[PDB]
Amino acid sequence: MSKIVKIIGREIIDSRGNPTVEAEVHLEGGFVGMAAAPSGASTGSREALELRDGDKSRFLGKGVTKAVAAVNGPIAQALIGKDAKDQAGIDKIMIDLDGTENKSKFGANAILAVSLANAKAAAAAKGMPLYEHIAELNGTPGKYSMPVPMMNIINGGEHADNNVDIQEFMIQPVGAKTVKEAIRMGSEVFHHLAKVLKAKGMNTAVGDEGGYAPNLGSNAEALAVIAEAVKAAGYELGKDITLAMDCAASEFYKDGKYVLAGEGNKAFTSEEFTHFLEELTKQYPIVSIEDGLDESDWDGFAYQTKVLGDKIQLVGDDLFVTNTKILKEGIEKGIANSILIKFNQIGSLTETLAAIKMAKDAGYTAVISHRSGETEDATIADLAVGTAAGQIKTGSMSRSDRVAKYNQLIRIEEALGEKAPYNGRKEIKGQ
Amino acid sequence: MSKIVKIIGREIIDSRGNPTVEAEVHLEGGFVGMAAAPSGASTGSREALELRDGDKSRFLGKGVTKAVAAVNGPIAQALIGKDAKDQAGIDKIMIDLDGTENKSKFGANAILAVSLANAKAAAAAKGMPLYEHIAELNGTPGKYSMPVPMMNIINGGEHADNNVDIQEFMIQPVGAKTVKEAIRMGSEVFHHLAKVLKAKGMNTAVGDEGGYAPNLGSNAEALAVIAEAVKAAGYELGKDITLAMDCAASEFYKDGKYVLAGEGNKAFTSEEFTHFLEELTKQYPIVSIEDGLDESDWDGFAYQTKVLGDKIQLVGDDLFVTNTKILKEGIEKGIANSILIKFNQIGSLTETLAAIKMAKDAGYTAVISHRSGETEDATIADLAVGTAAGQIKTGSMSRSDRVAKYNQLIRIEEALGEKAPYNGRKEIKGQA
Amino acid sequence: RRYRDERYPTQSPMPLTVACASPELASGKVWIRYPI
Ligand SMILES: [Mg+2]
Ligand SMILES: [Mg+2]
Ligand code: NA
Ligand code: NA
């Protein structure tokens, strides 16, 4: 009923200065939606293909003119005249026309940008916000929550050129009563952490995700300075604020072993790394650990899930790449208990909702996530609210590539009130 | 169909994690505009008042609930039923209702958020983009240009905790033929600069404006590594890329002297600092220097304008604070030859257009500028294009608080094509 | 001078109840296509 009349793709710039794909979907009657594809750095090997040009004379080879041409040409022609409200039909047309398993013909960045822009245009045609339309697409209309955020305030790994191997150290304001209060608590701790770091003579410039990127004596020292900032900010660690990590351990898995390069190449077997992580959760209220082993180390993950899974949320990111075919095998093999949801790992909104539903049906939690390369787009805020996912990972409290998502969450909660409860700690698997 | 029916203020978060004011303006026909106030760090002493709460139990005292209440209550009530297309009339109502010269009752952050949201809503009511509405407000309909950007890829001063005293070291892609090409050139140099810095073991994490924040042996070494990145990216320094600086010298003016803390507290008189800068403009193609002296050092600025003004663009930022009363005195005293346009230094769109017009009429250039604390808002892109200012300063090529403006420039240039020429080097005062 | 045309929309074809219904439209990063 809400026909597409024009689709426009363009090459814009992401939060790291690299090209990415932006799409506009226009409907008859004037309704418009616009979205952009984010871009990972620590990309899992089974993510759908992010199509780049490889022309060394433009953007050091990282242009996206081929993906943009797919949007403007073959994708646009296939969608003119179709009903924007039929999200699954729209995504199927693009997915099938591409015809490859990993979306390597058009690029997952082309298809995703159109997929999200289309859903926004359809929401406008229905006179409703995206989160409300998403809940209708999800078959759960009017069912909302404001997500509990995990905020990455010390950056390492591929996200910063410091000596920290662990990618992300996060705080979660589970004690807050609203997402608005959670955001302030994160801001206050983040600012107190800068004072803690300067008093130790450590660097307070920020990494890709807006967290500080100091050099540390060990990876675990990040937890120590975060604990100091939480206290100096006046909050009680373990009651007002809990802790989460994204190891991105696929980035330091070498020759069957996990090697912490920043700590003199200290080496661990899969077992030993699981018990290293276990000991950190006894010293600190770490309640969530993402990608604690390599994406291929399923034997290791089965062991880690038996050892930690009853007590800790274990989030598969590169492990599952937001892909129901992989998540399904994990559920049947007792692998992890949570999935990080990145719609550019799979490339369409419809496939993303399927991953979220499969998680919830199995009792796994779903954490809606940014990528380390972001734009001013705030689609994941509407996605987390409109699926009542319960958790979001969208960066530190600095850089607008992160904070724009927090601002959209503030606006949505203002609009929804008690219709979008902030459920706090119990959202986290094992709490 | 253009009368205001509703205005909402709210507290959102800026790019440093601090609160700021967002406003939405709704019109009877369903048209809506939304904008936010940015926030400086090296703020001039005569900027209009940024109103904050001072409640230490919230945001370390940096909440803006009082300004937000001003938006929702007295300001909104004074504007209900008024014509959003009458921008000068909307701004006058707010300015007169506040009743103070420096907007200290409601806050310039409250008045500005509404002023800008109103202009966006009126543009929608007229079925046109903001830059087109701005050109009509300006009395110059259909007159556009894409601005030449100065891109701050090494951050210092108040914007980074390194030992660099100069606030900003910038590249200008004057050789580009479109702003889209300018943006690609800047990104490429920015990425090559990372490789240059890493090879020297220098820090590549970024400061407030998205530029690298390394520690340097001297302030001038920033120009050396930048020149080195320009060459590695395959561009010709002085032909494809020129250089610009924002000293923010008011931040290191102590006891009548300019003191470079990162260089062992090396001290300069006003005259000595001017000749230190002059020698840099002979070693490097620096064609623009902003706030090379303290905001109060008008005698020094007069001398700096004699020594450098014929060859260098001299940009007043803290000197003029986007304020026609002060710019007017500078023009009459032969002080500088360019002004940095920050609408939150004065607090309304109408007063901002007045500063841009006053500069143009005197032959000064106008450089549309972000603040160090920004949001995802991209109003300044539309402002620079719709006044054909010719130049923009909106950050490094990283962090979406900067890049969102570059993306808006890309979209606008795509829409306008040849109707918005990118004029290149000749936009800069003293260049042809 | 400044020019005066045949002009404007009477009612927005994409009314937002609140601006977070479409941040892109409200902030002015994407535009309705006129006519119709
Ligand atoms: Mg991850
Ligand atoms: Mg300045
Ligand atoms: Na690292
Ligand atoms: Na500094």
Numbering used by the authors:
A (entry chain A): 1 to 431
B (entry chain B): 1 to 432
C (entry chain C): 813 to 848
Please quote the authors directly.
For E. coli, the key enzyme of RNA metabolism and riboregulation is RNase E, a conserved endoribonuclease which forms a large multi-enzyme complex, known as the degradosome, that incorporates the DEAD-box helicase RhlB, the phosphorylytic exoribonuclease polynucleotide phosphorylase (PNPase) and the glycolytic enzyme enolase. The C-terminal half of the enzyme, which is considerably more variable in molecular evolution compared to the N-terminal half, provides the scaffold of the degradosome assembly. This scaffolding region is predicted to be predominantly natively disordered, with small linear recognition motifs that interact with the canonical protein components, RNA and the cytoplasmic membrane that consequently compartmentalizes the assembly to the periphery of the cytoplasm. A segment of the E. coli RNase E C-terminal domain, encompassing the binding sites for enolase and RhlB (corresponding to residues 603–850; hereafter RNase E 603–850), also bears two arginine-rich RNA binding domains, which are referred to as the RNA-binding domain (RBD) and AR2 (arginine-rich region 2).
To explore the structural impact of enolase binding on the adjacent AR2 element, the enzyme was co-crystallized in complex with the RNase E segment encompassing the EBS and AR2 regions. Well diffracting crystals were obtained and the structure solved and refined to 2.0 Å resolution. Two enolase dimers occupy the asymmetric unit. The cleft has 2-fold symmetry and the EBS can enter the cleft in one of two equivalent orientations. Although some broken density could be seen for the N-terminal side of the EBS, no features could be resolved unambiguously for the AR2 segment in either of the enolase dimers of the asymmetric unit. Nonetheless, some portions of the AR2 peptide could be fitted to the density at low occupancy, but it is clear that this segment assumes multiple conformations. This suggests that the AR2 region possesses significant flexibility and does not adapt a single conformation when enolase is bound to the neighboring EBS.
